[PDB]
Amino acid sequence: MVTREEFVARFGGVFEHSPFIAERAYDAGGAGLELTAKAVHGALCAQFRVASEAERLGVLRAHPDLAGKLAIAGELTGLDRLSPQEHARFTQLNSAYTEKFGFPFIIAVKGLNRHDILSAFDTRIDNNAAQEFATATGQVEKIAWLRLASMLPEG
Amino acid sequence: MVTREEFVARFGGVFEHSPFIAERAYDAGGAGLELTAKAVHGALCAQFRVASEAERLGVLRAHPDLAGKLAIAGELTGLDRLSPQEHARFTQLNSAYTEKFGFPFIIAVKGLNRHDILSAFDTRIDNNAAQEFATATGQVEKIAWLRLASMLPEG
Numbered sequence: 001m002v003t004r005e006e007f008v009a010r011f012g013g014v015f016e017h018s019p020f021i022a023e024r025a026y027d028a029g030g031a032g033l034e035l036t037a038k039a040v041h042g043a044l045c046a047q048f049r050v051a052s053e054a055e056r057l058g059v060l061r062a063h064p065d066l067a068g069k070l071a072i073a074g075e076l077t078g079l080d081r082l083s084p085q086e087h088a089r090f091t092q093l094n095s096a097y098t099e100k101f102g103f104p105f106i107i108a109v110k111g112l113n114r115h116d117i118l119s120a121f122d123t124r125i126d127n128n129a130a131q132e133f134a135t136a137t138g139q140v141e142k143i144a145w146l147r148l149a150s151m152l153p154e155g
Numbered sequence: 156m157v158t159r160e161e162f163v164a165r166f167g168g169v170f171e172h173s174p175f176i177a178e179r180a181y182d183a184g185g186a187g188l189e190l191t192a193k194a195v196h197g198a199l200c201a202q203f204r205v206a207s208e209a210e211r212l213g214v215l216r217a218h219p220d221l222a223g224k225l226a227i228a229g230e231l232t233g234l235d236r237l238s239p240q241e242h243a244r245f246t247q248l249n250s251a252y253t254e255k256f257g258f259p260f261i262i263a264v265k266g267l268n269r270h271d272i273l274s275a276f277d278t279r280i281d282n283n284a285a286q287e288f289a290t291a292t293g294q295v296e297k298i299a300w301l302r303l304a305s306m307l308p309e310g
Contacts, residue, residue, distance in 0.1 A: 006246075009246050009250055010243075013220075013222065014226070065168075067168065067306075070231075072227045073232075074302055074304070075224065075263065075298055075305075076265065077232075084190065084306060091164050091165055092161070092164075095160075095164055110230055143230055146230045147227075149229070150225065150229025150242075151242045153239060
């Protein structure tokens with residue numbers, strides 16, 4: 001049986017720094033889920049979707065920036081072969097983006113090369129607040145899936 | 156020339172959620188550093204070492220847990236081939252550890268397999284608060300190096 005403490009411990013980080021997502025999922029009957037990425041992701045997205053707009057904005061803002069993800073990868077391990085200069089460009093593009101939108105540049109990165117990312121910045125910096133909020137929230141969900149897929153059978 | 160905003164942006168995350176490390180390094184003459192992992196790491200550790208014990212304790216507590224690092228790796232990519240069950244054990248060992256010490260289990264993981272990690276938990280859970288604080292701070296510095304080494308030439 002999956003206790004609360006364990007579920008939240010567990011899946012509290014799937015939406016970065018957002019354990020409330022996992023708490024509410026648990027109160028919606030989380031412990032009865034099949035422990036598969038499909039099941040748990042559906043359950044977690046459900047809470048993310050139903051959270052207030054302020055709360056969703058909080059999730060975006062807590063999400064790590066790209067350079068931070070790359071550095072965590074560098075602790076364990078063509079996004080793996082970036083320049084000192086290309087790392088720096090990511091940092092700069094991320095500063096520009098957050099200065100415009102008020103949250104980091106969030107992008108699911110599995111299978112993506114450096115160009116794919118530059119392309120997405122290019123397109124996305126030119127959107128308005130409502131479009132980027134749709135895209136960013138989509139991407140966060142995204143990342144949730146990718147995280148869960150590494151931890152769980154898919155379903 | 157490296158501006159403040161850029162340096163902190165930059166190297167603010169090398170000690171996770173601890174931009175003050177990078178701010179103070181900048182005021183100690185950070186912009187005159189050779190941009191190498193050796194140079195920048197020496198400069199950042201210097202501030203980490205000279206910070207109050209409360210501040211150092213804050214850095215430990217902000218550091219991500221192992222499952223959180225593995226999940227970020229799962230977004231990009233034998234720690235890469237873990238069980239749903241082995242993931243879960245990491246979460247549990249981390250809960251036990253933080254319940255004893257009051258900060259996450261922090262360990263540099265480059266080159267380490269699942270056994271190496273279990274071994275380290277095993278040894279370290281049995282230490283006293285002062286020993287683990289020495290070890291954890293050593294490991295955080297560690298990780299700083301590994302992060303910087305992926306972003307910069309070594310020196």
